[PDB]
Ligand binder design. Structure first.
Ligand code: NAP
Ligand code: ASD
Length: 316
């Protein structure tokens, strides 16, 4: 409903539902709850191994008449072991086959860190470092363009790119389509203000994940890291507005022109998150939240920090 117009003329709802949870179905149940609560933008990926269940949930809410297909904005992502140009369309077609849909609304390069092709999601060496691939990302992008022209994806964009990595695509000779979006880690402890200003200058929408502080998976999160939603400024703002620290975090993104994802597998929290549209943070609230920035990415593991194209080496 509240939507941004993408640089390709398509529209994306500003609030999105995060479908990923740790390997520990449930995806089916909570995705239907999300749609029932009012979410229209649904975020999945090959990586999540949940596209059958998320696709099922969406089609179920269309079949029962709750929504029409054109009312749902469905995103999947090309996994980093499928960057070689010849793998891209088959990876999209397989995503579509799993979801049982004709097209995705949005197909993303999940990460700028190409990995060796194969059946493993993150092939790693004896030293825990990912086995990386040298495929030119511009050729991956050209294959994404062809997926858009084939009608298999209404829009195409990227995820986890820094400014440099974005400029590589933007500066490609023969570029047909700019990415519509860059989906990146973004929250009050890592607000990406410089990258956000850059994206806006290029008509690229910044889409925030881990907007509620991440699920803190022991596999990649520093257990030392502060819990975002325990932040005392966020909790003081929540008390002032009679909302919750989660709502304060989501609303912050909306007011700075960031499209925001929120994962919840809890029925009460799913319904709560749609309340982000019900209230407004003041100019001073926003400045206070801006002051929380610690440049803190919660995804913080050697396995990927070792990768030559790790986006967090650059200033932004
Ligand atoms: N492109 C990428 O590389 C990338 C990376 C990470 C995530 N993502 C996407 O973004 C989505 C969200 O990111 P995220 O998974 O890191 O999670 P998140 O949205 O930051 O959520 C963190 C935790 O917040 C809790 N929560 C939700 N609403 C709450 C509320 N109102 N009050 C208190 N707690 C609340 C949830 O726990 P409960 O489930 O118990 O409510 C959830 O596990 C993912 O599911 C995925 O779709 C993409
Ligand atoms: C979640 C993830 C996937 C599969 C896996 O095995 C390990 C990780 C941890 C690091 C994540 C990566 C996805 C790519 C990320 C988001 C970036 O662009 C920087 C941090 C990096």
């Amino acid at each position: 409903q509240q939507c941004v117009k993408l640089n390709d003329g398509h529209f994306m709802p500003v609030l999105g539902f995060g479908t990923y949870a740790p390997p520990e179905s449930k995806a089916l149940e909570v995705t239907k709850l999300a749609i029932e609560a009012g979410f229209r933008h649904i975020d999945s990926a090959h990586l999540y191994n949940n596209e059958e269940q998320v696709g099922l949930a969406i089609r179920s809410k269309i079949a029962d008449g709750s929504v029409k297909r054109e009312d749902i904005f469905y995103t999947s992502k090309l996994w980093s072991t499928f960057h070689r140009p010849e793998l891209v369309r088959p990876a999209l077609e397989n995503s579509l086959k799993k979801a049982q849909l004709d097209y995705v609304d949005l197909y993303l390069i999940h990460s700028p860190m190409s990995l060796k092709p194969g059946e493993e999601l993150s092939p790693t060496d004896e030293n825990g470092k990912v086995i990386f691939d040298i495929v030119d990302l511009c050729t991956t992008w050209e294959a994404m363009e062809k997926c858009k022209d084939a009608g298999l994806a209404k829009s195409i964009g990227v995820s986890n790119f820094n400014r440099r990595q974005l400029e590589m695509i933007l500066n490609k000779p023969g570029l047909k389509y700019k990415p519509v979006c860059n989906q990146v880690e973004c929250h009050p402890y890592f607000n990406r203000s410089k990258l956000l200003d850059f994206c806006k200058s290029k008509d690229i929408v910044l889409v925030a994940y881990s907007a509620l502080g991440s699920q803190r998976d022991k596999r990649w999160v520093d257990p030392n890291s502060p819990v975002l939603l325990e932040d005392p400024v966020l909790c003081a703002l929540a008390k002032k507005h009679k909302r919750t620290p989660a709502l304060i975090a989501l609303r912050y993104q909306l007011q700075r022109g960031v499209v925001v994802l929120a994962k919840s597998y809890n029925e009460q929290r799913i319904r709560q998150n749609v309340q982000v549209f019900e209230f407004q943070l003041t100019a001073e609230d926003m400045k206070a939240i801006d002051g929380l920035d610690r440049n803190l990415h919660y995804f913080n593991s050697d396995s990927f920090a070792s990768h030559p194209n790790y986006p967090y080496s650059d200033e932004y």
